[model samples]
Target: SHMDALRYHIEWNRVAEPGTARPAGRLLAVISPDHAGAPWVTAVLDALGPDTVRFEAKGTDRAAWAAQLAQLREDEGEFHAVVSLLAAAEALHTDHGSVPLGLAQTLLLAQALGDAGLTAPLWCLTRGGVAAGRGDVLSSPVQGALWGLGRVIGLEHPDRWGGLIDLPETVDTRAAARLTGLLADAGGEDQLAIRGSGVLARRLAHAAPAVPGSGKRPPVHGSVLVTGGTGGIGGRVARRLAEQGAAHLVLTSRRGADAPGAAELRAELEQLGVRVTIAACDAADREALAALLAELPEDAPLTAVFHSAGVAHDDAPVADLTLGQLDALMRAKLTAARHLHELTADLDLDAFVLFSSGAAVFGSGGQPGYAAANAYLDALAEHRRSLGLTASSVAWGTWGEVGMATDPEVHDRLVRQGVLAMEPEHALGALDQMLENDDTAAAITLMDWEMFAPAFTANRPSALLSTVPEAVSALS
Candidate 1:
């Protein structure tokens, strides 16, 4: 079973079992004022009749919202379930800009619900593009960010975590019925994607071995830029490109030439027979990025761009997080990524790679800003693909030898949490696999489901790991 463990399929509607008793007691539905007026939500509201308590968030104040939730829980008693509608959240563009207001509000609500001591299954209902069985779906990248946040929330507080459910733009009565039933049902899958007649339950496991496929590879002779090049993961990636015959490697970081081991790293790359350029610049600054791009020789045109510039934090939870800290975390990722995409929109590059994190993909507690920023990267990669651009965002786990995760306490903590440190060679090989397969976006990491599943499910059943045989077996 372990050897046979590979990719697993999730059939959404299949997981919402038939004949389950409707939820008893009160239900808590969290929605923004704008989201409350949505069609699908309206339908669900109409179908459910009453027995529902609404907690409306306007995205104004976190403390007030938490207090309100606390007040509501005290007055309403225990809730049978908690349902979140993400449709209205898609419209939170100009007001909230890059941040998904729905997702942000939901995260706050989740924190408040926990603090308020309301332990009910939490389900997120959003548009179809969020989860798909086949090819890429053009969902809102911000919604995707919410999905990431929701997943982490589920992991951190499993007992109250329901799962992600994707629906069509217009959910008919039948779909509404199934959705309401799933929400009300005491048991159901963690992640569900509903497309037309099909209801799918999504599960993740190890990818199958490569079957001798062929696609594009990083060009060996043109100039390639790696942001955060002075760092461990970026440096490893840069070296990998060089070994593959890339002639020009341009590396940038805030510290640039002054970064530790800069001279030694430069010498090593030179020895590998690649012309290297190390620059001190902040990628988030458009002017600096422009100058860096302009410095490339005319003969050696830019061939690829690798965005590995990012920072990770563990000091604050989403509820305690301040806007200033959030701003700092997002600058290098969301801001810098936008600039890079805009600047290179006209370029005919072979690869436009982004280094995202598993925190965004599966969600990690205590790193909300980091999760949101990386989620944007994943979404941006998909957006780039929709525009017929070459883009791939690798949602990486931990790197064994270097970078932010190298701290001993952090390493031990994560190891127990199911994300094992990846050997650089193996990680790079996985990266190469993604590149060769032309995957738009992927989560490349080594996991021992046996170890990860039990802890993840100790508090409650994890719908995300439902498809993994090892996880299922372990839980049973």
Candidate 2:
């Protein structure tokens, strides 16, 4: 019974003999124009022989690129698989940073292939997304953002998604051999990492103890800032902090004190004997955030920051999505979070918490932009850890009766996909466990393995959950 809580992580094992790789078929290779002559692509091509089809991505014309890809999908007969070298597209010169142009193009490609009714498995190859071993896999945040979007694409079109593979940047015969195996074999896991030793995949073992205790936290006395505190999830977090003895709680959002229910929320926290300050400043604006921070009373110096400011989406697929949409989606998550991090970097805050989502963790079909944005949050937390700062990004699933997923259509869809709604108390309990443990980042949510595993793997195999004992036994 104790072992049931553990999720099995399926991974790739390296072969000691290192046999020659088998060719899948005529390979469709998507290459960035800047990296057209890269050694890794060359070696892989040499090993696969001369039958590879190539498309070079250059310039900002997504329309032109999508049209060509759609035409190719209609014209091309058969291929072993659709392999993308767009993972490192950022290494080349580019203007897009928060949402890399390479990542945006890859999303368009996936959308186009789907539109044209291609069924070949899509494999995204990257050199810098993962680490050397089973460490945190956010070495490249921009690349990491792509990985998040790709995982969701796999879920949306399971029949065509092969998996995510991270390779060493420097190319050689050994790496080419590894590529050959990946190209030929049906991908066993949903995601993977390749280094000199062998191939690796992420499995969620016990990052924390089995049972979470209601541990005592450091007493809160000074001011605490909770971004988006007027919203559903943020409101709950702000109330909890007040209950924990925070003397002054500063809550902020784009709407500030005029946000709906802002007055009611203030009344609730004031009843708990904590001073409430609600402001209407944008988190992404450096000037606004600086002014907000400066307003904290000297007697109530800032003690903590809980970044719950984010927006969810219900819109068109990534195929028809535009760059303006990306800017709108990334501004709150990426840009706002960056401001929060930079502004607070020098402060000795007790905790720096971020709100993330499962769309980024496990991937979702319609929310590619949301997934990429949240993925940045998770990676940012890890990045902060590398610098010895306190940060934790919580990758949450659907919450019952609150926040996003309030729409019946959204709620029912997620339920069918295996991510169940989490009770507010239960979700907060998990959050407490993470804070006490001082973890860099974690995914906290309720899931029904039987329902989730099937929906997650219906189109393609998801090795990400294979290591979970419950998931394995459920599918078996």
Candidate 3:
């Protein structure tokens, strides 16, 4: 399993100031209706100085924003940059359904900007969207999803993408100055968190080995719920849980027993002395999930949840992604996870594991919606830990024998980019290690950085990967 002996975790390192020259050129600041009057917005705009123009996004649709952006460009003429404050609009909008208004609006804004042929790079701003480090509180995990979306934006539209910046809660004079300086010149650092101490840039670094005694796998007992249990990865996870001594396995999928291989999977798990129940239920439906939970056997009380339900079928590049497609992606990843968190917050569960993707952590091109959805899982895990709950989100690479990347074409494409497939056993072993160490978030992936860094950074340089020695060597 340690053949490569590699793992990655997100770290925020302090950044040295990049000169004090104020940015010269007209800037366009876009704000969502909800955050139009926020004081931080005022402070940031003020910091950008007199050449800044502000646009209030009144609709959640892409066409409306596109129209407005085009008109703005026509009137203002060749803005130097575009700063979006839509990440601060955390409230859900009825227009977008379950998707966060902020996330949806941000997606629309990006699409609109591209549609309007706005050549200026777009920078997204968020406050409390990140836990910079220890002692830092993550107040808005939902906002953190924006970082995931923004990462994909950078990959898909490198030329038009500026970067993502996490603002401090209070934008005092010093913080404002730092923000302006970053806007002027990010010093090749894009993902940043501006706090009172200094500016911190996000990096992907190797995870430390678990302590000796702390590496024991957590015991599996009682009824464990595995959403999307009929799917390739979920089915494999169900088998692993059963082998780990789960008393009962409740697997939920839209097709349940009718799903391909579900019958054989149940028989196999039952052969391992684990009682198995297959139910036709959509995990995203609150009422359905509640009913399914209520039907759990009294003898085997629910003790763990493995949320592996999500769809990436309709995902497209940020430029072509539609609100409907985003909604479909969010239903399984975001809405279901939120429902699970709310429903199980009080449960004395041993684990609340979420199946995330490297797309969210590393920003896979052409998968903005998928990335955004998975990023929420990673952030939600941290947010749960802050509330003293057990949660872990594993951002996985492609699996060899199973999963969405199993297709020959997709697998070869990823292999060319240095993302090797992981054997199911190895990936599950890594999961066991994470559970044993009680890690809140971890990315389990096999990377041939020698091939990856170059392919990933072919268009633009990545400050995120600079901390990885292998990536650095590869890039060099």
Candidate 4:
């Protein structure tokens, strides 16, 4: 599992002066377990140097905590960056020189009351006013806190780490844009009646609910099935479907809460006079896929199915990727796609839109495995389309600012490799064009090296990303 964590990391290189690089240094910014394993937060910025940052759980109990810290010390680990609970802040403060900086964890309402000497991020202080059922994907409060923490940390010491959208204008403010609702179904608190009543109340203001079975006439129901519906690109497609009155919509994902964007959109669709459903199923699994298809049989035909659910950089050049990752991606993006098309043939599924990439067209230097996988997807689409299925594989360029395009390191490496780059806006524009057109309009239309180049080399952050909610929901 830890090896898998290592695989999921988003690895990118920093664009830098001819030969300049942030001097190698190390600091253990341990967030304890309550930080919910934000390990890649450190990895993405490996500027801390490869060997510099190391993470270990101190566990919740005192003895576990003692052993964790003791091991680091026993290994002669130097004292630099550390995040600790408010309950342990006093002890940390008494040993400030030995610990350098400390972060205090506390409840939202009592945010201002950090350990006597500690401080809190603005969003953390306010708690994102998240609705009762929405805390997992991110309470408005946590979103604010997380990115805000990134912002303030950037400003207080811009030289330390900039580009957190930390411009002077947005600080001291909360991100008003709807928070990404999808997240791992986490936490122990029970929302039960409280959250249910809350969702029902707020649900009406958004969009039309596609109940389990509605005898209502089909509106020809241009429903689109978006895998990874909560993801950035998938989120874009989901919103567009609702906006265009795609009368029927289906968002599939493994995590229920991970489909918050779908929730937000589903609510909005109700207002748009469309029916939508969120089904928990990993698009990669045949059996799970079968169940969802059989259950939703009445909605016989689908407008289009988009396979945006993809994993990147699981391994390096052929040797870098593991057999497991190779197999996993094949099952999730390719094999499973085959089954959906075979079974849905009778349903008159209009188009099988598969997510491909420039990587499929070009040689992705670092991620040979990923590039190969995307290439396979592109070829598969071609073969399937030839067989009476209306299939198209729109290979994307970049994720604008949403995907791996913004990684600082990825840019640095691109410059070194001479991959002419562009801003986030350009990438967003390309994606917009792809979505506005019909599924068959332009297969492999958008291509940008800046975007593709980074994806070629971008590493994955495995520790932080959760398994698809479809997987967990079935277990529950």
Clashes of each: 11, 7, 0, 34
Q: Candidate 2 local accuracy as lDDT? A: 0.74
TM-score ranking of the models: 3, 1, 2, 4
Residue pairs whose backbone atoms clash in candidate 3: none
Q: Where in model 1 is the C-alpha error above 4 Å?
A: 1-26, 34-53, 90-98
- Return the lDDT, model 4, position 170: 22
> What TM-score would each prediction reach against the true structure?
0.86, 0.86, 0.96, 0.44
Cα lDDT tens digits, model 2, 389-419, are 7888888877887787677787898898678
What is the model-wide C-alpha lDDT for candidate 4? 0.39
Model 3 worst lDDT run, 10 consecutive residues: 209-218
For model 3, residues 66-170, the per-residue Cα lDDT tens digits are 888899999988888899988878777686666888898888888889889999989999887788966777777889889899999998899989999888878
* Order of the predicted models by lDDT, top scorer first: 3, 1, 2, 4
Off by over 4 Å in 3: 1-6, 215-217
Give the per-residue lDDT of model 4 (tens digit) for 1-476.
21111111111111111222222223443333433323223322233345544443332233344455456645644433332222212122222111101222221111211221122111111121112232222122112212212222322222222111111112121111111010011021111111211211111011122232232222335566777776666766666666656766677777744554666766766787766677777776778877766665444446677777776645443313333544554445545565666766666565577776544433344554355445445545545544555666655544444544457766465445434443434433433343333222232222232443334323321111123222223223
Please give the lDDT score at residue 373 for candidate 2: 82
Q: Give me candidate 4's TM-score against the actual structure.
A: 0.44
